[PDB]
C-alpha cells in the first residue's frame, strides 16, 4: 500500500566505463527485485534507449527506473554515454544519494571509471557501492582479488572510503537471464543499497534558504521579498540573514504569505513572500538569499567543474580562452567573473568539461554543490557546480 509513497525514498544510479554493464545491471536489478518482492521488471532495450531530458538548457539522455526493496523505494538513473554522466553530474539533473559503480572484472578500471569517481567526488556524490561485473567470464578467483584491490585503491585515491566500500562480485547478464546463483548477487547488491546508503536528508530538513527575486514595500508593515523556498522552513518570529552581494544583514521574519493567504511558516518548494522587520527596500536586492543565520556565507572565488555546451546544445560554435569574462548565473542573478583554466590549458572546446577556478566581481552566498549557469548576454553557454569555495 505504498501508493501513498510512505517508504523512505533514495535516488541512485549506475556509473562506470562504457560497456562494463551499467544498463544490463540496471535491467537486472529491476527484474530480480520484481521476482523477489513484486514490481515492474524492465528489459535491457527500454533502459538502453534513454530519452532526452532538459537539465539547464542542456540536453541529456537519461533513463529512469524505480524499484523496491522491502524497506525502501529507489529512483535509479542510467545513461548511454560518458557525456551524459558528465552533464548529469554537473547540472545535477538527476539526484544521486548514492552511486553504483560498475566495473567489468574482465577489464578492470578504465578511463571513465576514474573520471566518474573524480566527478562524483567533485559534485558531491556521498556514497558509492561497487558491482564487480562479468564475473561469469572470470573464474580466476585470484585475478578478482586484484581488481577489487584496484577499485578500492582507486576510490580512496579520490577520497571515498575504499576499505569500507561494499563490493559485490556478480554477473548482471546472468542474473538477468535467470541464473539463480547470480540473481542472489543482485539481491546482495540491493541489500547493500539498503544497509550502506543512509536515508537522504529531506530539503525540508536542511537549513532554511530562499533566493530573493522581487522586493516591495508594504506601507506600515514593512519590506517583503518573494521567492521559492529552496530548502528548509522559515517561521514567523525567526531571525534570518540576508546574504550575498552586499555585506550580510540580520532581520526577522514578521510574516509569510502565499497565494495571498498569510501563513505562520514557509516551506521548501513553496513560492512565498516574506515580510522582514526593519529592512528597507533599498538594502535588499534580487540575488541575495534569506538564510538560516550562520549557515551560508558570501564568497567571490571558487573551484568548479563546468560543462561547456556543444554547438548543437545551442552553445558556442567556437572555443573560449582565458580572458573570458562571462556572466555566472547563481539562482536568481548574474555576476561577472574571471576564469583560470587548468595548468597548461589555453582553450575550452564546445562540449568539453574542465575544472575552472572562478573569481566573481562581487560576492554571492555559496557552498560546495551550488549549481550555476554560465552565459553570454543571456545566451547559455555552460553549466557548472561549485566544488570548493576558495574565498
Amino acid at each position: 500500500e505504498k501508493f501513498e509513497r510512505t517508504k523512505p525514498h533514495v535516488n541512485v544510479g549506475t556509473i562506470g566505463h562504457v560497456d562494463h554493464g551499467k544498463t544490463t545491471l540496471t535491467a537486472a536489478i529491476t527484474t530480480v527485485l520484481a521476482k523477489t518482492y513484486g514490481g515492474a521488471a524492465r528489459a535491457f532495450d527500454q533502459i538502453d534507449n534513454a530519452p532526452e531530458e532538459k537539465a539547464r538548457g542542456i540536453t541529456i539522455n537519461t533513463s529512469h527506473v524505480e524499484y523496491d526493496t522491502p524497506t525502501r523505494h529507489y529512483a535509479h538513473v542510467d545513461c548511454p554515454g560518458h557525456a551524459d554522466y558528465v552533464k548529469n553530474m554537473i547540472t545535477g539533473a538527476a539526484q544521486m544519494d548514492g552511486a553504483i559503480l560498475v566495473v567489468a572484472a574482465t577489464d578492470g578500471p578504465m578511463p571513465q571509471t576514474r573520471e566518474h569517481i573524480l566527478l562524483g567526488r567533485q559534485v558531491g556524490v556521498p556514497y558509492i557501492i561497487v558491482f564487480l561485473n562479468k564475473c561469469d567470464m572470470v573464474d580466476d578467483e585470484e585475478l578478482l582479488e586484484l581488481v577489487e584491490m584496484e577499485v578500492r585503491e582507486l576510490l580512496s585515491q579520490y577520497d571515498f572510503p575504499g576499505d569500507d566500500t561494499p563490493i559485490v562480485r556478480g554477473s548482471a547478464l546472468k542474473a538477468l537471464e535467470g541464473d539463480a546463483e547470480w540473481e542472489a548477487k543482485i539481491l546482495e547488491l540491493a541489500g547493500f543499497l539498503d544497509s550502506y546508503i543512509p536515508e537522504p536528508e529531506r530539503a525540508i530538513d536542511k537549513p532554511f534558504l530562499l533566493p530573493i527575486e522581487d522586493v516591495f514595500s508594504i506601507s506600515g508593515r514593512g519590506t517583503v521579498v518573494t521567492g521559492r523556498v529552496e530548502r528548509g522552513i522559515i517561521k514567523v518570529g525567526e531571525e534570518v540573514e540576508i546574504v550575498g552581494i552586499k555585506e550580510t544583514q540580520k532581520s526577522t521574519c514578521t510574516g509569510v504569505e502565499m497565494f495571498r493567504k498569510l501563513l505562520d511558516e514557509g516551506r521548501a518548494g513553496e513560492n512565498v513572500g516574506v515580510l522582514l522587520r526593519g529592512i528597507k527596500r533599498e538594502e535588499i536586492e534580487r540575488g541575495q538569499v534569506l538564510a538560516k543565520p550562520g549557515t551560508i556565507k558570501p564568497h567571490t572565488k571558487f573551484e568548479s567543474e563546468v560543462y561547456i555546451l556543444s554547438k548543437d546544445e545551442g552553445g558556442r560554435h567556437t572555443p573560449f580562452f582565458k580572458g573570458y569574462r562571462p556572466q555566472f548565473y547563481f539562482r536568481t542573478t548574474d555576476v561577472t567573473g574571471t576564469i583560470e583554466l587548468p595548468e597548461g590549458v589555453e582553450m575550452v572546446m564546445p562540449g568539453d568539461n574542465i575544472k575552472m577556478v572562478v573569481t566573481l566581481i562581487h560576492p554571492i552566498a555559496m557552498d560546495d554543490g551550488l549549481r550555476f549557469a554560465i552565459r553570454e548576454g543571456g545566451r547559455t553557454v555552460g553549466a557548472g557546480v561549485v566544488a570548493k569555495v576558495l574565498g
Binding site: 527575486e213 522581487d214 518573494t226 521559492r228 498569510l262 513572500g273 516574506v274
Partner: peptide, 12 residues
Amino acid sequence: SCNCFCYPCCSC
C-alpha cells in the same frame, strides 16, 4: 503579496 497558483509573488 501577489501570486495565486504558482508564479513568484506575495505578501506579508
